């Protein structure tokens, strides 16, 4: 509406655009690592609810699609283990969960696509290695789109700013001219 | 066909098997149940000069100490190190 208001929004959406881009780049590297680790994890995999996701949002419909234990801080806050997702999952993570004790996880397909004794620890591990590959791809995807949406909003807001900037000057001048005439 | 993997490495996609129980596989495995092992390694990577140091260190905590099932964990570590 007013130049000061747009000024603050513009600085805000400019920061977001940059952060979303950097977050896309971190997730791209995290996915690159995860997809490499998923290869030997699948061949190993071949041979109560409770719900598998992570602590971190900004990954689209990863948490919502999978949503009394739940691995991931998002699972319990929406509906217990914390500190998952940030560091790639290990078999030790699966053991911790199994020791504290269907299985609901996001299965990796591609960068865009994903779908919802000792072998007990194997199944938890399988779900973990698939989940993070899906989560890192989905975050990379969502942040790419967010950074694009931020870009288009920066342009739209900059145009509104400049039309308002010009209109303010023109209006002030017309009031001055009218008073003088 | 025969499949042999750890959670991180694939070795194969007669087999001598230790029963799992820490020991040698001839086509070193830690434990588990296609042969599934928590840690499967060479054989080139193992030392072995430091496993003797690990065995003696585990036999040092055994003469502790004391409280049951602690203890039972120490003995398992002694069994893995002896193999």
């Amino acid at each position: 509406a007013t130049l000061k208001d747009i000024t603050r929004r513009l600085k805000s959406i400019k920061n977001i655009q940059k952060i979303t881009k950097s977050m896309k780049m971190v997730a791209a590297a995290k996915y690159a690592r995860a997809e490499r680790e998923l290869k030997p994890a699948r061949v190993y995999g071949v041979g109560l609810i409770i719900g598998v996701s992570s602590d971190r949002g900004l990954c689209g419909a990863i948490h919502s699609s999978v949503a009394i234990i739940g691995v991931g801080d998002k699972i319990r806050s929406i509906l217990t283990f914390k500190e998952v997702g940030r560091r790639p999952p290990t078999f030790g993570d699966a053991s911790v969960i199994a020791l504290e004790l269907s299985i609901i996880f996001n299965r990796f397909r591609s960068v865009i696509s994903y779908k919802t004794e000792y072998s007990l620890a194997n199944i938890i591990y399988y779900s973990l290695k698939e989940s993070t590959t899906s989560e890192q791809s989905a975050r990379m995807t969502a942040m790419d789109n967010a950074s694009k949406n931020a870009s288009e909003m920066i342009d739209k807001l900059t145009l509104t700013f400049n039309r308002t900037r010009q209109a303010v000057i023109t209006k002030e001048l017309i009031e001055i001219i009218s008073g003088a005439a | 066909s025969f499949t042999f993997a750890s959670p991180t490495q694939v070795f194969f996609n007669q087999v001598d098997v230790p029963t799992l129980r820490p020991g040698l596989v001839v086509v070193f495995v830690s434990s588990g149940s296609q042969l599934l092992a928590e840690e499967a390694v060479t054989l080139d990577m193992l030392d072995l000069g430091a496993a003797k140091a690990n065995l003696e260190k585990a036999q040092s905590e055994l003469l502790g100490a004391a409280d049951e099932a602690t203890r039972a964990e120490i003995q398992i570590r002694i069994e893995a190190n002896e193999a």
């Binding site: 030790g92 053991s95 199994a98 020791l99 004794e117 000792y118 620890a121 | 820490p22 070193f28 830690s30 434990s31 588990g32 928590e38 840690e39 390694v41 193992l46 030392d47 072995l48 430091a50 496993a51 690990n54 049951e68 099932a69 039972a72 964990e73 003995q75 398992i76 570590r77 069994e79 893995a80 190190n81």
Partner: peptide, 25 residues
């Protein structure tokens, strides 16, 4: 019955200890 399975313990803890002893060597 195995000694580790008396006061405790699971085979998951067995394998966890054995796997770590391989890494540390």
């Amino acid at each position: 019955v195995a000694y580790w399975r008396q006061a405790g313990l699971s085979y998951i803890r067995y394998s966890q200890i054995c796997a770590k002893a391989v890494r540390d060597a």
